[PDB]
């Protein structure tokens, strides 16, 4: 996260840290005791899925305070429409091998119903994005969890406020822009898969997933996030299904 602040320990309880062979891979969002939502591209170059670990209750990577809870990842479900190496349909649903225990430092973010998210949450100006990603473009990653408040924009406004690149991916109906174009605040590499949380009447909901963007905090550019509302039904159906052999699972979408 660039231009943000440290998320006070426990104020980002749904934040998940994904590790591969002990190394930081991506962020994620706990939505219940055994399910985590992340970004599909996070698993583009995974060799052995048996080395994927999800950590809840994490805050400071330099120490262990006992609030951390680690779980193996039993399943990584990606939409059939996602194509490795691209940006569209950047979402993944992870099933933990064992549920985490809810505590003051480990709490799920609410996955909203489609209607509510499209006709209410989508209209909430600011939302929080968080992660242990790079603090600066081409810079080192954060040791403490960082958080940033970013304003959401209409896809039409985004395109009309962003500098054309041509080779740059297009903004589909499965994504949305959020952030600033003055190159001051934005999510960055390492934050991918993390939550874009929206508050409404005292409760927080998952509205987006850190997906991509031109560099980090690049002037004339906004961060791009996966529009979670388009996958509510897809996610709910999968969470009611039985686990299947093999970690990786491509599921039809819609």
């Amino acid at each position: 996260i660039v231009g943000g602040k440290v998320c006070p320990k426990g104020e980002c309880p749904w934040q998940v840290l994904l590790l591969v062979n002990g190394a930081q891979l991506c962020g994620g969002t706990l939505i219940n005791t055994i399910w985590v939502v992340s970004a599909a591209h996070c698993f583009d170059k995974i060799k052995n899925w048996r080395n994927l670990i999800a950590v809840l209750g994490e805050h400071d990577l330099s120490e262990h305070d006992g609030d951390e809870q680690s779980r193996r990842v039993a399943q990584v479900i990606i939409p059939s429409t996602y194509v490795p190496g691209t940006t569209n349909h950047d979402i993944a649903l992870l099933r933990l091998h064992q549920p985490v225990v809810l505590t003051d430092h480990v709490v799920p973010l609410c996955l909203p119903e489609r209607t509510f998210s499209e006709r209410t949450l989508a209209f909430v100006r600011f939302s929080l994005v968080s992660g242990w990603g790079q603090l600066l473009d081409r810079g080192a990653t954060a040791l403490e969890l960082m958080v940033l408040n970013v304003p959401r924009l209409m896809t039409q406004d985004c395109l009309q406020q962003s500098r054309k690149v041509g080779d740059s991916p297009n903004i589909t109906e499965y994504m949305f822009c959020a952030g600033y174009s003055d190159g001051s605040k934005d999510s960055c590499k390492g934050d991918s898969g993390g939550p874009h949380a929206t508050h409404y009447r005292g409760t927080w909901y998952l509205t987006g997933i850190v997906s991509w963007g031109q560099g980090c905090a690049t002037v004339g550019h906004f961060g791009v996030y996966t529009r979670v509302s388009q996958y509510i039904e897809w996610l709910q159906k999968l969470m009611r299904s039985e686990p299947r052999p093999g970690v990786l699972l491509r599921a039809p979408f819609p």
């Binding site: 006070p8 426990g10 709490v107 909203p112 209607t115 009447r201 005292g202």
Partner: protein, 61 residues
């Protein structure tokens, strides 16, 4: 004052959480798992220790 409103699209139908429209001048509010709907028909109250979307350290101030 707190109730009223039918169209869920307008001000969330007055619901604190989820809203559903019914045939005619009807509206039903609902709450996420771990919450119950109050008698006002719009408010949601936690029914568990750790409901989703709530920050414990802040709820306890």
């Amino acid at each position: 004052h707190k109730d009223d409103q039918l169209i869920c699209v307008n001000e969330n139908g007055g619901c604190e959480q989820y809203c559903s429209d019914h045939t005619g001048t009807k509206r039903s509010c609902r709450c996420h798992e771990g919450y119950s709907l109050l008698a006002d028909g719009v408010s949601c109250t936690p029914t568990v220790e750790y409901p989703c979307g709530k920050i414990p350290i802040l709820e306890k101030r």
